[PDB]
Paper text:
The C-type mannose receptor and its homolog Endo180 (or uPARAP, for urokinase plasminogen activator receptor-associated protein) mediate the endocytic uptake of collagen by macrophages and fibroblasts. The large extracellular region of each of these receptors consists of an N-terminal ricin B-like domain, followed by a fibronectin type II (FN2) domain and eight (MR, Endo180, PLA2R) or ten (DEC-205) C-type lectin (CTL) domains. Here, we present the crystal and solution structures of domains 1–4 (D1-4) of Endo180 and a mutational analysis of collagen binding.
The overall structure of Endo180 D1-4 is the same in both crystal forms (the root-mean-square deviations [rmsd] between the four crystallographically independent copies range from 1.2 to 1.4 Å) and only the high-resolution structure is described in the following. We have determined the crystal structure at 2.5 Å resolution of the N-terminal region of Endo180, consisting of a ricin-like domain, a fibronectin type II (FN2) domain, and two C-type lectin (CTL) domains. The inter-domain interfaces are sizable (ricin-FN2, 552 Å2; FN2-CTL1, 674 Å2; CTL1-CTL2, 662 Å2), suggestive of a stable arrangement with limited inter-domain flexibility. The D1-4 region contains five predicted N-linked glycosylation sites. No Ca2+ ions were present in our crystallization solution, but we observed electron density for a metal ion (most likely Na+) in each CTL domain in a position corresponding to the canonical Ca2+ “site 2” (Weis et al., 1998). The Na+ ions in Endo180 are coordinated by Gln326, Asp328, Glu333, and Asn348 in CTL1, and by Glu470, Asn472 and Asp493 in CTL2. Comparison with a typical Ca2+-loaded CTL domain structure suggests that the Endo180 D1-4 crystal structure is unlikely to change much upon Ca2+ binding.
Author numbering: 40 to 101, 105 to 136, 156 to 363, 379 to 511
């Protein structure tokens, strides 16, 4: 019971209590008494755990506080955490209202929508509270189920509407609700029957201890397209440019090292900011309006010294090769120097390279490339690709050439991809000696 809280008045010096059908302030604050335990629930109602009822007052026309069945409409059961204090002070003839035991205001523990998994409600969130077999529930329950799985109604009256779904769980395994890749031990959840917005889908994955699908490897694309063959669907993935336009990122902060945009994508930069995978294109990526309602896919996984003319940063040595060469020839020159084309794994390393090594050189080669397999970028030095810093609407050279290599471009230190044909200076990286 982490969302539950007591309501204290400094002006009356006591906690708000609900007895029978009445509401009072008692100086005897006791966090154990459910009569004093409150909880925000759906549709801006304030729920009491002792009475299993909702705080209410009269509509304009008859003013007092009382407890009422939460589905009563003949009374106003709606409150706002910002004005609740003023309403309580008004109706009790009081000062300042806070959560008991803290300096936090009554807006500190807000109601969060919990989106359902599978069931028959297309991902619609739990209606809190809901009635089932004439009993109120202010949370998920397994009563009425043998397997013990937690569920909830998506209307307030299950007996009437029979709309429901499974509740999301934060698990250390991937048992009931997930397809697991045995090779990578990564778990995937295709909610074909749900219809949620991107942000809603994001929240759903998050409250399962997961994130929207990121596709980081060529294999991962193949495994994903695999499970999708036969189905006909368009599903949200973690891809978006909400922060920076054209700056596509995975919601789970994975590097944008693999790409599978459809031929004409992405487009409509002014309206479409979120990524979808499609079965029609055999797993191609599109960008769409983030507010549209779609099925979605979740994912979870249960001080050195340098040689002369080189400069140190962290544990490596860096050097500018000012002579303009091709990407491959730039690399060959780095190797003869006992190093390789620079690999960049953090923002601090990037800043060092850009401010200290590149300086006013306009554009130059780094180690990132997709010569081996196209649309799948890797560092020439074989290092793990953990970090990308693409310019807006980059990369995009796989859209023409069959071989793409990467440069640092301009003062921000962001990256382009380009034909390796191009003649540019470059930066080299090798390990340093400690010291
Ligand atoms: Na589009
Ligand atoms: Na490019």
């Amino acid at each position: 019971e982490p969302n539950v809280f007591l309501i204290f008045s400094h002006g009356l010096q006591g906690c708000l209590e609900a007895q029978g059908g009445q509401v009072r302030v008692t100086p005897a604050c006791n966090t154990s008494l459910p009569a004093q335990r409150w909880k925000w629930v759906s549709r801006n109602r304030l729920f009491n755990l002792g009475t299993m009822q909702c705080l209410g007052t009269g509509w304009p026309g008859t003013a007092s506080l009382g407890m009422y069945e939460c589905d009563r409409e003949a009374l106003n059961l709606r409150w706002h955490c910002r004005t609740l204090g003023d309403q309580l002070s008004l109706l009790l003839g009081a000062g300042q209202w806070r959560i008991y035991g803290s300096e936090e205001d009554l807006c500190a523990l807000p109601y969060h929508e919990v989106y359902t998994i599978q069931g028959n409600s297309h991902g619609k969130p739990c209606t809190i509270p809901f009635k089932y077999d004439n009993q109120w529930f202010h949370g998920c329950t397994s009563t009425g189920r043998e397997d013990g799985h937690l569920w909830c109604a998506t209307t307030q009256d299950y007996g009437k509407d029979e709309r429901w779904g499974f509740c999301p769980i934060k698990s250390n395994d991937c048992e009931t609700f997930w397809d697991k890749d045995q090779l990578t031990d990564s778990c995937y959840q295709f909610n074909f029957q749900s219809t949620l917005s991107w942000r809603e889908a994001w929240a759903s994955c998050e409250q399962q201890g997961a994130d929207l699908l990121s596709i980081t490897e060529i294999h991962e694309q193949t495994y994903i397209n695999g499970l999708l063959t036969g189905y006909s669907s368009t599903l949200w993935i973690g891809l978006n440019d909400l922060d920076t336009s054209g700056g596509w990122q995975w919601s789970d902060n994975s590097p944008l090292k693999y790409l599978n945009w459809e031929s004409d994508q992405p487009d409509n930069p002014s309206e479409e900011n979120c990524g979808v995978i499609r079965t029609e294109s055999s797993g191609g990526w599109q960008n769409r309006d983030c507010s549209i309602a779609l099925p979605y896919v979740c994912k979870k996984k249960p001080k050195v010294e340098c040689e002369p003319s080189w400069q140190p940063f962290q544990g490596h040595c860096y050097r500018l090769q000012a002579e303009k060469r091709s990407w491959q020839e730039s690399k060959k020159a780095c190797l003869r120097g006992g190093g390789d084309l620079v690999s960049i794994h953090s923002m601090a390393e990037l800043e060092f390279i850009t401010k200290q090594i590149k300086q006013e050189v306009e554009e130059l080669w780094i180690g990132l490339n997709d010569l081996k397999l196209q649309m799948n970028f890797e560092w020439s030095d074989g290092s793990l690709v953990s970090f990308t810093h693409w310019h807006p609407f980059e990369p995009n050279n796989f859209r023409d050439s069959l071989e793409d290599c990467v440069t640092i471009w301009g003062p921000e230190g962001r990256w382009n991809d380009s034909p390796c044909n191009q003649s540019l200076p470059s930066i080299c990286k090798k390990a340093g000696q400690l010291s």
